[PDB]
Design a protein around this motif. Structure first.
Motif, PDB file in Angstrom:
ATOM      1  N   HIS A   2       0.869  -1.205   0.000  1.00  0.00           N
ATOM      2  CA  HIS A   2       0.000   0.000   0.000  1.00  0.00           C
ATOM      3  C   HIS A   2       0.886   1.227   0.000  1.00  0.00           C
ATOM      4  O   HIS A   2       0.914   1.976   0.969  1.00  0.00           O
ATOM      5  CB  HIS A   2      -0.951   0.058   1.212  1.00  0.00           C
ATOM      6  CG  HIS A   2      -1.957  -1.041   1.252  1.00  0.00           C
ATOM      7  ND1 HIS A   2      -1.737  -2.228   1.926  1.00  0.00           N
ATOM      8  CD2 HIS A   2      -3.205  -1.129   0.738  1.00  0.00           C
ATOM      9  CE1 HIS A   2      -2.793  -3.010   1.797  1.00  0.00           C
ATOM     10  NE2 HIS A   2      -3.694  -2.365   1.075  1.00  0.00           N
ATOM     11  N   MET A   4       0.807   4.107  -1.705  1.00  0.00           N
ATOM     12  CA  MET A   4       0.151   5.444  -1.736  1.00  0.00           C
ATOM     13  C   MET A   4      -0.376   5.815  -0.374  1.00  0.00           C
ATOM     14  O   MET A   4      -0.109   6.888   0.139  1.00  0.00           O
ATOM     15  CB  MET A   4      -0.947   5.486  -2.793  1.00  0.00           C
ATOM     16  CG  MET A   4      -0.397   5.339  -4.214  1.00  0.00           C
ATOM     17  SD  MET A   4      -1.684   5.153  -5.463  1.00  0.00           S
ATOM     18  CE  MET A   4      -0.593   4.921  -6.874  1.00  0.00           C
ATOM     19  N   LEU A   5      -1.049   4.859   0.248  1.00  0.00           N
ATOM     20  CA  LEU A   5      -1.596   5.046   1.566  1.00  0.00           C
ATOM     21  C   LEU A   5      -0.449   5.249   2.543  1.00  0.00           C
ATOM     22  O   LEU A   5      -0.454   6.178   3.328  1.00  0.00           O
ATOM     23  CB  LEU A   5      -2.437   3.828   1.899  1.00  0.00           C
ATOM     24  CG  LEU A   5      -3.375   3.809   3.074  1.00  0.00           C
ATOM     25  CD1 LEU A   5      -4.276   5.026   3.167  1.00  0.00           C
ATOM     26  CD2 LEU A   5      -4.231   2.576   2.915  1.00  0.00           C
ATOM     27  N   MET A   6       0.563   4.401   2.448  1.00  0.00           N
ATOM     28  CA  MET A   6       1.713   4.489   3.319  1.00  0.00           C
ATOM     29  C   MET A   6       2.496   5.784   3.163  1.00  0.00           C
ATOM     30  O   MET A   6       3.016   6.294   4.127  1.00  0.00           O
ATOM     31  CB  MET A   6       2.620   3.296   3.073  1.00  0.00           C
ATOM     32  CG  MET A   6       3.807   3.199   3.999  1.00  0.00           C
ATOM     33  SD  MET A   6       4.112   1.465   4.335  1.00  0.00           S
ATOM     34  CE  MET A   6       4.118   0.679   2.701  1.00  0.00           C
ATOM     35  N   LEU A   8       1.035   8.693   2.096  1.00  0.00           N
ATOM     36  CA  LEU A   8       0.174   9.730   2.682  1.00  0.00           C
ATOM     37  C   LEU A   8       0.176   9.777   4.236  1.00  0.00           C
ATOM     38  O   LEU A   8      -0.192  10.821   4.844  1.00  0.00           O
ATOM     39  CB  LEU A   8      -1.239   9.578   2.155  1.00  0.00           C
ATOM     40  CG  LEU A   8      -1.310   9.870   0.659  1.00  0.00           C
ATOM     41  CD1 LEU A   8      -2.609   9.309   0.085  1.00  0.00           C
ATOM     42  CD2 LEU A   8      -1.160  11.355   0.395  1.00  0.00           C
TER      43      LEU A   8
END
Ligand SMILES: C=C1/C(=C\C=C2/CCC[C@]3(C)[C@@H]([C@H](C)CC#C[C@H](O)[C@]45C[C@H]6C[C@H](C[C@H](C6)C4)C5)CC[C@@H]23)C[C@@H](O)C[C@@H]1O
Lengths: 11, 239
Positions: A2, A4-6, A8
């Motif tokens: 993850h 992108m999540l990580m 952000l």
């Protein structure tokens, strides 16, 4: 699995 | 005598500001999204709206007191599972009971049940979604309560994939005690009547909405044609 999540979530 | 401690007021002040930093009640960024069409005509715009909103939810989460003490894996599982819930919750701010629509400043950005079904949802999701928005709007939460509920929602220990449930529970406990204590000291009767328990029940409605949401997403997903039209944050988060 993850980047992108990580990215952000990072400081 | 339940007293709102300094620490509880600090908690509240942080979450208010965290909300103010991540919810733009101008709705200005909406021009950046693929435009709405009114055959799944709304899917590109609403994918974008939801994608944007995941970003804001992630920014709010990061400011929740104690959230940055979680492992980055726990942070991840907590956002993946809550995102859609927190979006339904925050969206209450633009929902209006006049029309039973979400009204974000102009006719283009005004979203009703036809728009939601025009993104592939049936009354399976829409009907309990609207009832949820209606019931939440009728609670008339103070902004303080709204922001606590969002944060309590994110930091739930029972989410699938959670590793350190004890830590997640300890953080959420400090938030629920802050909420319970705030209702007591600051929410007048009769509005405050079982307001906590009514708020928790909304979290149960959101779990059930989440479940239905998963079904409909998983269904929409199995056609790459449709999945193509989403964003990569949405694919990552809901896939
Ligand atoms: C977001 C917010 C707003 C409105 C939320 C709405 C009204 C439009 C329709 C939404 C966005 C509902 C959606 C359509 C419910 C859903 C869903 C699926 O996850 C879906 C369906 C399709 C395909 C995927 C991406 C996108 C479109 C979401 C999965 C839930 C909440 C609803 C405006 C504003 O208050 C900001 C807030 O942050």
């Amino acid at each position: 699995n993850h980047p992108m999540l990580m990215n952000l979530l990072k400081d | 005598r339940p007293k709102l401690s300094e620490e509880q007021q600090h908690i509240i002040a942080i979450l208010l500001d965290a909300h103010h930093k991540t919810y733009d009640p101008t709705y200005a960024d909406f021009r950046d999204f693929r435009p709405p069409v009114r055959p799944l005509s709304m899917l590109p715009h609403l994918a974008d709206l939801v994608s944007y909103s995941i970003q804001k939810v992630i920014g709010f989460a990061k400011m929740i007191p104690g959230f940055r003490d979680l492992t980055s894996d726990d942070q991840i599982v907590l956002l993946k599972s809550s995102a859609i819930e927190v979006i339904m919750l925050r969206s209450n701010q633009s929902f209006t009971m006049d029309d039973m629509s979400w009204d974000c400043g102009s006719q283009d950005y005004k979203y009703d049940v036809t728009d939601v079904s025009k993104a592939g949802h049936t009354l399976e999701l829409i009907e309990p979604l609207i009832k949820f928005q209606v019931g939440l709007k009728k609670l008339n939460l103070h902004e303080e309560e709204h922001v606590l509920l969002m944060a309590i929602c994110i930091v739930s220990p029972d989410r699938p994939g959670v590793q350190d449930a004890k830590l997640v529970e300890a953080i959420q406990d400090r938030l629920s005690n802050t909420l319970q204590t705030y209702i007591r000291c600051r929410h007048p009767p009769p509005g405050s009547h079982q307001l906590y328990a009514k708020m928790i029940q909304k979290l149960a409605d959101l779990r059930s909405l989440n479940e239905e949401h998963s079904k409909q997403y998983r269904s929409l997903s199995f056609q790459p044609e449709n999945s193509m039209k989403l964003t990569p944050l949405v694919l990552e988060v809901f896939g």
